[PDB]
Amino acid sequence: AEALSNPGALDLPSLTSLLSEKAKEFLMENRVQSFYQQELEMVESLLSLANQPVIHSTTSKAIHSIFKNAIQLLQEKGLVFQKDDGFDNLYYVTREDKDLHRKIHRIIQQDCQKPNHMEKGCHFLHILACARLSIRPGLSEAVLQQVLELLEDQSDIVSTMEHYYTAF
């Protein structure tokens, strides 16, 4: 509550961290599926937080920079992702991509296409290798981890060993 009440006291990295947290809260509360960066810049509560003297010391570039860095923190955490689409400012929210969840679930249900003499289920890295071939070549470890956590929360998959998953 303190930082949010006086964000002008923060150094730029701390401010960027805080903006990223408030951006996450916005995206989750509104069940946003995809967004252009500029849409977050238009949320008054986010722009008011971001717009501190430290960002200014062009103006549009200063605002673009802090918002881009905040969104990238969410990307690094696997909460948002991009497609190879030529749209630098378009982002997708991992938790809202139902097709992605279903496809990862299917990969796991099918034991990552392993012959039936091998172990049921598959390792994180195997799932990732399959998903990059069949779904999205750029899929990060962090985005996959977020999908797996959601599937686990839904009791659709179970971890039987460290980083190893089978259908529930």
Numbering used by the authors: 190 to 246, 258 to 368
From the manuscript:
To elucidate the function of the human telomeric Stn1-Ten1 complex in telomere biology, we prepared the full-length hStn1-Ten1, the truncated hStn1N-Ten1 and hStn1C proteins to homogeneity. In both RPA and Stn1, the OB fold is a ssDNA-binding domain while the C-terminal domain is important for protein-protein interactions. The additional wHTH motif in hStn1 may allow interaction with a different set of proteins that function at telomeres such as Ctc1.
